[PDB]
Design a binder for this molecule. Structure first.
Ligand SMILES: O=C(O)C1=C[C@H](O)[C@H](O)[C@H](O[C@H]2[C@H](O)[C@H](O)[C@H](O[C@H]3[C@H](O)[C@H](O)[C@H](O[C@H]4[C@H](O)[C@H](O)[C@H](O)O[C@@H]4C(=O)O)O[C@@H]3C(=O)O)O[C@H]2C(=O)O)O1
Length: 353
């Protein structure tokens, strides 16, 4: 105790969440199929782009849900989070472009945007009890994934990169210093904090942050029912199946990131249950939503289970690694999700001969 990875260290702050050089090499030389071609991001002059300015002062974000933790969405929510969504989108896009092209211009463009946010002490001042707490985990991790691919890049302002790295480290330490509630301590939100702590711990060579991140994956494995369902996600009523899938996203990224540091989280299990059990459940429940009735009576919102949904990004990473079948036939168009490092089609998908 208190968990099996409590002595783990960051070996290589530049290792990112994929083998950057190997993948770029593959993208520039390999035998690409139609879907990988479709995933190639389009080059543009990012030096002339206007990027979102950070909120000055207090980060104030309305609750997502009108009431409780499900049902109709709050009308005031989306107009406010849009700024953050633009920030994430741009960040992930520039990260993906750097991987694909190796052009330092994309790295410099990312750093200038992040420097601007860092200067303003963004993602630091907020009520931990508000929606803002969640927004921080999503945006900070998104920026960190993109930055992680360019930690080895020599043609940038190294002082700027450092300044930006330090900033994200402060963000993550502050954000993860709050235990959360009865649910948020231990549900998908916990796992999102885990991915944030893991990737930021890597790039800032912060072993303590890294370990805390790995710990969240461990916590999750002990919260899987025998059918493979996550305990806390099965209480979300009509969003139950949605949140079961949603949990897969950061858990996968923690695993992928840790694998670059020589740790095999996928192999970790608790009572013979592992992340594979959870995958099987998602696939099985999408086919047969009577599986969910055991937990929730409302018909399930299945908006996430459509080709092209960001929500499926975790499948690209897992399938590349384990070679399982696309049972649902969702892996047709490319997938892009800033919050899990952009396009996992671009970064992980291997055409099968
Ligand atoms: O990927 C797409 O192609 C896509 C297309 C759509 O046009 C639209 O852009 C869509 O937006 C997605 C996307 O993931 C976006 O970030 C947002 O994600 C949601 C999640 O789906 C959850 O609802 C999440 O959960 C928490 C909730 O925020 C609140 O904190 C509550 O108390 O706890 C929840 C929990 O995590 O336990 O919130 C994010 C969000 O960013 O608000 O919306 C989805 C979408 O389907 O609309 O993607």
């Amino acid at each position: 105790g208190s968990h099996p990875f409590d002595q783990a260290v960051v070996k290589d702050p530049t290792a990112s969440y994929v083998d950057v050089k190997a993948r770029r090499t593959f993208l520039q030389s390999g035998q690409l199929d139609d879907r990988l071609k479709a995933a190639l991001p389009k080059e543009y002059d990012c030096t002339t782009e206007a990027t979102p300015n950070p909120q000055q002062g207090e980060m104030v974000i309305p609750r997502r849900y009108l009431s409780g933790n499900h049902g109709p969405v709050n009308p005031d929510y989306e107009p406010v989070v849009t700024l953050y969504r633009d920030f994430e989108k741009i960040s992930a896009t520039l990260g993906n472009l750097y991987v694909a092209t190796g052009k330092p211009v994309y790295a410099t463009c990312l750093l200038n945007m992040l420097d601007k946010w860092a200067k303003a002490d963004a993602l630091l001042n907020y009520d931990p009890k508000s929606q803002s707490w969640y927004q921080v985990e999503w945006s900070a991790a998104t920026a960190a994934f993109a930055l992680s691919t360019m930690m080895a890049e020599p043609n940038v302002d190294t002082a700027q990169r450092e300044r930006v790295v330090k900033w994200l480290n402060r963000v993550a330490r502050h954000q993860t210093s709050f235990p959360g509630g009865d649910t948020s301590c231990c549900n998908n939100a916990s796992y999102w904090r885990g991915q944030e702590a893991t990737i930021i711990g890597v790039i800032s060579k912060d072993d303590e942050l890294f370990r805390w991140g790995l710990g969240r994956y461990v916590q999750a494995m002990g919260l899987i029912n025998e059918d493979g369902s996550f305990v806390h996600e099965m209480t979300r009523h009509e969003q139950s199946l949605h949140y079961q899938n949603y949990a897969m996203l950061p858990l996968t990224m923690i695993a992928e990131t840790a694998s670059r540091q020589g740790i095999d989280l996928y192999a970790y299990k608790e009572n013979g249950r592992d992340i594979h059990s959870a995958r099987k459940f998602v696939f099985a429940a999408v086919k047969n939503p009577d599986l969910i009735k055991k937990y929730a009576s409302e018909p399930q919102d299945t908006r996430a289970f459509k080709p092209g949904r960001g929500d499926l990004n975790w499948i690209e990473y897992q399938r590349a690694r384990f070679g399982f079948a696309d049972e649902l036939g969702f892996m047709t168009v490319p997938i892009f999700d800033p919050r899990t490092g952009g396009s996992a089609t671009l970064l992980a998908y291997k055409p099968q001969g």
